[PDB]
């Protein structure tokens, strides 16, 4: 039927979802077509917060859905920079290569 | 009712559930009751693969289920040393605590 | 009519059919063209495990229908390295011969 969630603070609720680690629920939203680029109040994408939490897999679903790595939070760091902050080497490497792809 | 898995390659199936990142599957499984130590064809417990991927979240669930840490691998790689190989210092310390408890 | 396997856990599947003793089942996979050097969660090719197991005829047939002796696992160990770890001089000899043949 081509419906959409159309939820207020959809990106902020996505950041809360990443906070709760609802990986399957995140995947179902992104399969339906929810925007992972939509950030929270602090301009943090769900990719931003997931990278800050070292959620390599969850950030990878976010990347597949198109969560922007070149986007910047309220502090002005990309999700990749949040990955460097957390130190999750796997998610750090994934986030390098996804940012490099997005730069084109 | 008392239903039981009794699955063939239950060690391998557990290890693949670990490798495929099915955290909710593990939750239902630990809730259902399942040896957190069943070894695969390479004699690896589920927590072996959990630490080899540095899955501090999922490995923690196996630790909660009481996953064996002292048990080594076909190469001498205990899941504690698997976490060391991955580089998850947090998981290294967690598995170190569990293994030091398991010494007795 | 153009069928295929499309099975997941292909590395698990191959390593197990070699290990469980149903190498005829493995041969039936190879009849369909299933690549023995399929992806594994630990990068364990079936011949790795088989050579380190101590059985010969099973790894023998597996490598007979094709294999990768120079394939590395997640530790970088080759099936020949696993034969060396097991010290299976018969497996070591066969695997060295196939390794040289492959490298050629």
Curated annotation (Swiss-Prot), chains A, B, C:
Tissues in which the UniProt entry reports expression: Expressed in guard cell-containing tissues, in root epidermal cells and in root hairs. Detected in vascular cells of the root and shoot.
- Give start and end residues of every ANK repeat: 9-38, 42-71, 75-104
**Where is the protein situated, by its record's location annotation?**
Membrane
Induction is noted as: Up-regulated under drought, salt stress and cold conditions. Induced by abscisic acid (ABA) treatment in roots and shoots but not in guard cells.
Which cysteines in this chain are paired by disulphide bridges? none
Q: So what family is this one in?
A: Belongs to the potassium channel family. Plant (TC 1.A.1.4) subfamily.
Task: Reproduce the free-text note on domains from the UniProt record.
Answer: The segment S4 is probably the voltage-sensor and is characterized by a series of positively charged amino acids. The pore-forming region H5 is enclosed by the transmembrane segments S5 and S6 in the Shaker-type (1P/6TM) and contains the GYGD signature motif which seems to be involved in potassium selectivity. The KHA domain (rich in hydrophobic and acidic residues) present in the C-terminal part is likely to be important for tetramerization.
What does it do? Major selective outward-rectifying potassium channel of the guard cell membrane. Involved in regulation of stomatal movements according to the water status. Assuming opened or closed conformations in response to the voltage difference across the membrane, the channel is activated by depolarization. Conductance of the channel is modulated in a potassium-dependent fashion. May interact with the cytoskeleton or with regulatory proteins.
Under the subunit heading, UniProt states: The potassium channel is probably composed of a homo- or heterotetrameric complex of pore-forming subunits.
Identify this protein by name.
Answer: Potassium channel GORK
* Coverage span on the entire protein: 619 to 722 of 820
């Amino acid at each position: 039927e081509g419906a959409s969630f159309n939820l207020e603070d959809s990106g902020n609720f996505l950041c809360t979802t990443v906070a709760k680690g609802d990986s399957d629920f995140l995947k179902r939203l992104l399969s339906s077509g929810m925007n992972p680029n939509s950030e929270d109040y602090d301009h943090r994408t769900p990719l931003h917060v997931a990278a800050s939490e070292g959620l390599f897999l969850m950030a990878k679903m976010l990347v597949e859905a198109g969560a922007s790595v070149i986007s910047k939070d309220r502090w002005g760091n990309s999700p990749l920079d949040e990955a460097r902050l957390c130190g999750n080497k796997k998610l750090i490497k994934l986030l390098e290569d996804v940012k490099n792809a997005q730069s084109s």
